[PDB]
Each structure stands twice: as C-alpha cells, then as structure tokens.
Design an enzyme around this catalytic site. Structure first.
Site: not given
Ligand SMILES: Cc1ccc(C(=O)Nc2cccc(C(F)(F)F)c2)cc1Nc1nc(-c2cccnc2)nc2ccccc12
Length: 275
Positions: A136, A140-141, A154
């Site tokens: 994805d 936006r990510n 993500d």
């Molecule tokens: C709390 C949290 C948990 C997991 C992730 C996240 O990036 N997970 C993720 C999963 C698989 C792979 C990767 C990656 F990209 F490889 F790194 C990341 C991000 C966040 N942080 C945020 N999530 C979210 C969010 C919003 C709505 C639904 N889910 C998460 N919004 C944010 C807004 C500003 C700053 C940080 C966040």
C-alpha cells in the site's frame, strides 16, 4: 514473546491517550504522550479481539521493532503484557505527505522534492531487502518530520491507481509491485499531491494502463526523474528497476545536481494565445 524480540515493552503508566486520530483493525488510534514527554501515536487492540487479530497485531509490532532505518517510522515500543495492547510510534507535526504537499504547493525546490524521493526509496530498499512487501505504498502512508525526512509507514487502507497490474489481476504482491507504487509516489511528489489519473474511475485507469497509456510528465519535472518513474510502470514486472537501482540513481542525481536542470517537456491541456 519471541515475535517481540526487537521491541521495547512500555509500561502503561508511561502512556496517556488524548484524542482519537483513526480506527485500527480492532481498536482506535490515538494521539497521546509518552513519558520531557514525547508526543506519540498509539494503536490499540481492544477487548474482544480475535486470535487472528492478535497474531497480526503482535506481528506488526514485531516487524516494526525489527525495522531500524532513517526512512521507516520509528516504533517507540509496545504494550503486550497488559490490556488493551498498544503499538506506540513517533508522531509528526507535519503529518502525511499527500496532505502536506497539497498544503504547500510550489513551496520547495526541485532538489528538496528529489531528496524526499531518495529517502522514500531508501526506506523501501530496506523493506524489500528485509523481505517485507508493503502492498500500500502511497503518499498518504508516508510521514514527514521537521527535517523534511520522509518515513514509510502503513496506516491501513483509507488503492487501484497505486497498484501494479499483476497485483490487481491476480494478487501478486512483491517488491516489484511496490516499485510500481513508488513510481506513482514519484508522480505525487513532483505534482505536489495531485490525484493520479485525475477524475478517471478505477476501471478507466485499469483500461488505460492495459491500453499502454501512462501518466504524463508533471510540470517543471527533471527529465531524469520522469524517465525513472516511467520505468517503474513497465507492464513486465521483471523489467522494472529494483529499489537498489532507484536509490542509486536518485543519489547520483542529487550528488550531481546539474543533472536535474534538464526538464522534460510538459504537454499543455490548454492553449493561451497572446501577442
Ligand atoms: C500507531 C501506529 C501504528 C502502526 C503504524 C505503522 O506504520 N505500521 C506499519 C505496519 C507495517 C509496515 C510498516 C512499515 F511501513 F513498513 F513500516 C508500518 C503507524 C502508527 N502510527 C500512526 N498511525 C496512524 C494511524 C491512523 C489511522 C489508522 N491507523 C494508524 N496515524 C498516525 C498519525 C501520525 C503519526 C503516526 C501515526
């Protein structure tokens, strides 16, 4: 417990949730503070979650702890020993890249924009090397910090127009389909967040791609940058650059910045005749 081998366990007394900023798979996401306090985002797994949800949630926490890279969102830690369980990441005032660029139209130099792309590419090279397929990748990510550093994240689904043909047609998601998405992200960055393919419907996008059409050059775009994004959109998956090639090219262009002064022709949609 082994899944969390790279994670730090945070005690609940150190966390304060403040405002709901999203919805997780089985819980809400909050803005909060982490114990001088640090602003954080907090994804919760709320009472009643299923076995599959717990496996996915702790697996997400585990891989985020494993990842340690300048261009990947930072995991502060996890709460796994108490309920509700939580994944706690850094928080960025500047927020998501798509909204950020749309709110800052024309405010950056070409070198700044290409530098953002090099950072995204470096994070993606790391993920692909670690054998993680994003599935994805889209502006936006991606989060932007106060140094303009882009961090791949993500947030879950809000993506036909970001997705490679083989991933749409038969669910073949690989680093090479992430490369297609990366080319779309390049176009998003260079246009300051324009919607890929404008008002075309999802079916019209897929038909256009199958017919051989591709997104046109952004305005004032370096020739080398458009050439690179175009090669990310090759129908044949094996012909696309790998992320190592993308990072290398972007690094070399930045380090020899005159290379970015040659611009691709822009095709005007509108003719203005004046004397
Ligand atoms: C709390 C949290 C948990 C997991 C992730 C996240 O990036 N997970 C993720 C999963 C698989 C792979 C990767 C990656 F990209 F490889 F790194 C990341 C991000 C966040 N942080 C945020 N999530 C979210 C969010 C919003 C709505 C639904 N889910 C998460 N919004 C944010 C807004 C500003 C700053 C940080 C966040």
């Amino acid at each position: 417990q082994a899944v969390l081998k790279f994670t730090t366990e945070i005690h609940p007394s150190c966390v304060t949730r403040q405002k709901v900023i999203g919805a997780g798979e089985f819980g809400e996401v909050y803005k909060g503070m982490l114990k001088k306090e640090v602003p954080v985002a907090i994804k919760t797994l709320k009472a009643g979650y299923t076995e599959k949800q717990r496996v996915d949630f702790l697996g997400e926490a585990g891989i985020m702890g494993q990842f340690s890279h300048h261009n990947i969102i930072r995991l502060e830690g996890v709460i796994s020993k108490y309920k509700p369980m939580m994944i706690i990441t850094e928080y960025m005032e500047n927020g998501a890249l798509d909204k950020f660029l749309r709110e800052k139209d024309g405010e950056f130099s070409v070198l700044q924009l290409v530098g953002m792309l090099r950072g995204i590419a470096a994070g993606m090279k790391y993920l692909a090397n670690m054998n993680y397929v994003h599935r994805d990748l889209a502006a936006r990510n991606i989060l932007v910090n106060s140094n303009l550093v882009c961090k791949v994240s993500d947030f879950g689904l809000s993506p036909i127009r970001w997705t490679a043909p083989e991933a749409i047609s038969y669910r073949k998601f690989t680093s090479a389909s992430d490369v297609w998405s990366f080319g779309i992200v390049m176009w998003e960055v260079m246009t300051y967040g324009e919607r890929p393919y404008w008002e075309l419907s999802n079916h019209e996008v897929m038909k256009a791609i199958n017919d051989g059409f591709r997104l046109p050059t952004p305005m004032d775009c370096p020739s080398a940058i458009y050439q690179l994004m175009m090669q990310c959109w090759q129908q044949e998956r094996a012909r696309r650059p790998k992320f190592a090639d993308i990072v290398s090219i972007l690094d070399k262009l930045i380090r020899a910045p005159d290379s970015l002064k040659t611009l691709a022709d822009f095709d005007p949609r509108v003719s203005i005749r004046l004397p």
